[PDB]
Amino acid sequence: TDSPVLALAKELISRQSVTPADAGCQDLMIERLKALGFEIESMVFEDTTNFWARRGTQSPLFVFAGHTDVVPAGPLSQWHTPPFEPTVIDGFLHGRGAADMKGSLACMIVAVERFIAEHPDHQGSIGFLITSDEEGPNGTVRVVETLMARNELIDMCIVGEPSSTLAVGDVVKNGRRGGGFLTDTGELLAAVVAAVEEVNHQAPALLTTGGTSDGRFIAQMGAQVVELGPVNATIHKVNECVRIADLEKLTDMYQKTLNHLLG
Ligand SMILES: [Zn+2]
Ligand SMILES: [Zn+2]
């Protein structure tokens, strides 16, 4: 039987959540998080479902952000495997969303599970901010404005978009907090770099620009933001896939980031 990482990633992949459809992916995540003490707030905007979940009431607020939607399969004649059927071949998990970004979502859930099991008494708070419209040419903005307008301000945020080139964690992208005009302690990037170095024994390359508008918005509003996720060589393409070993590594990097920040 699978690791909980692969088991959950497979589950997510099976749900045909073509933008902006969620197809029940968020309910899967919400069930896992409800079991860990998270309060959940579902929020629909336009044709999209979103949610915000939080565990803890104390500073800092650390958040995992991402989307459940995926882009269309493209030509089925080109697909070696059924696009919405998670298909394991030679150590790789094939399917729409494997890399962008249902793999990372499963890694976020199991990392928080493992962390909350080792550190039930963690500092700070853990949040999830999940949307289903990211591949569009709205949801993030609407959720973030809701949190701001009730003075619930994310301190630090990992966006699990697939940031990597050859191997998971070889690149991460760093947001500029408030566009580079708010003070920035570097506490998040230090934590993530620390985690990536433990796992890979190599520092990631850094980009300071170029991520998603979604993450750029979170940073502009005041969060420290880092994008860290799987290899992106196959995103939005036929025969999208992810190295399963890299999903185990990413889960560890997320758990280790949590240790450094909260544990
Ligand atoms: Zn994405
Ligand atoms: Zn995408």
Catalytic residue among 22, 113, 133, 134: 134
69 is catalytic: yes
Give which of 56, 215, 66 is closest to 129, Cα–Cα.
66
User: Residue 43's beta-bridge partner residues?
Assistant: 50
Distance in Å, CA 5 to ligand 1 centroid: 18
DSSP string, the chain: ---HHHHHHHHHHHS--BTT--TTHHHHHHHHHHTTT-EEEEEEETTEEEEEEEE-SSSPEEEEEEE--B-----GGG-SS-TTS-EEETTEEESTTIIIIIHHHHHHHHHHHHHHHH-TT-SSEEEEEEES-TT---HHHHHHHHHHTTT---SEEEE----BSSSTTSEEEE--GGGGTS----HHHHHHHHHHHHHHSSPPEEESS-S-HHHHHHHHHT-EEEE--SB-TTTTSTT-EEEHHHHHHHHHHHHHHHHHHH-
CA dist., res. 51 & res. 128, Å (int):
8
Distance in Å, CA 113 to ligand 1 centroid: 23
Ligand nearest to the CA of 160: 1
CA dist., res. 12 & res. 93, Å (int):
12
Q: Where are the domains of the chain?
A: 1-263
Q: Tell whether residue 236 is among the known ligand binding residues.
A: yes
User: Residue 156's beta-bridge partner residues?
Assistant: 62, 224
What was the experiment behind these coordinates? X-ray
Do 66 and 82 form a contact (C-beta atoms < 8 A)? no
Distance in Å, CA 121 to ligand 1 centroid: 32
Backbone angles phi, psi at 159, to 5 degrees: -100, 115
Q: Tell whether residue 161 is among the known ligand binding residues.
A: yes
- The CATH number assigned to the domain with range 1-263 reads 3.40.630.10
The tokens for 81 are 């495997």
Neighbours of 6 (CB within 10 A): 20
Burial of 149 (0-12, 13-18, 19+ CB in 10 A): exposed
Ligand nearest to the CA of 135: 2
Distance in Å, CA 178 to ligand 2 centroid: 24
Chain gaps in the chain, named by the residue before each (C–N > 2.5 Å): 137
Residues 6+ positions from 190 with CB-CB distance below 8 Å: 260
- Amino acid at the residue 189: L
Neighbours of 133 (CB within 10 A): 23
Report the relative pairing of strands 61-67 and 156-159 from DSSP bridges.
Answer: parallel
